[PDB]
Design a protein around this ligand. Sequence first.
Ligand code: HEM
Length: 154
Amino acid sequence: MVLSEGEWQLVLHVWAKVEADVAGHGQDILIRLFKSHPETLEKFDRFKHLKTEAEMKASEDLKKHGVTILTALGAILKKKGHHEAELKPLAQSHATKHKIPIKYLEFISEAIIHVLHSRHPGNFGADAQGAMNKALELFRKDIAAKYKELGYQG
Ligand code: HEM
């Protein structure tokens, strides 16, 4: 798929708001993911024990990782589709070391859209949401194709 420039603008205009507080957004997102789809919590041997949302909010580690996720995603979005290089190492560690099913990349895509909608209603109307959705679908389709090349499937 190809996003137009007007779609990329809508995605990079709400991402610039997310970058004013990356640690807060990365925390909200991960918690939204772990409450909605608790099975995803099992993939993190590092956070697995966290039992409540309050524990999650207090974990500094969890907040550090949220910043790692959003920094890597932001670097991919800012490429505006030319992200092949960035994708490579990310597809290799998530398909071979962490074993993360595409299904779980959809679940986090859903958590990102829920959090931007709650924090940025004015910059995240229907057109901007459609554009963000298109950009994450593009990210998931390219990762899925690398997963096949790398041998991960089902
Ligand atoms: C927007 C999507 C995502 C991005 C941009 C992302 C990115 C990252 C980055 C940059 C790291 C550090 C380096 C590495 O191991 O590759 C990482 C590690 C990891 N990721 Fe992801 N991730 C994403 C989605 C997920 C999802 C959905 C799961 C789980 C359901 C997942 C599970 C993990 C695990 C288990 C680790 C190792 C964490 C730790 O032990 O240090 N990732 N991820």
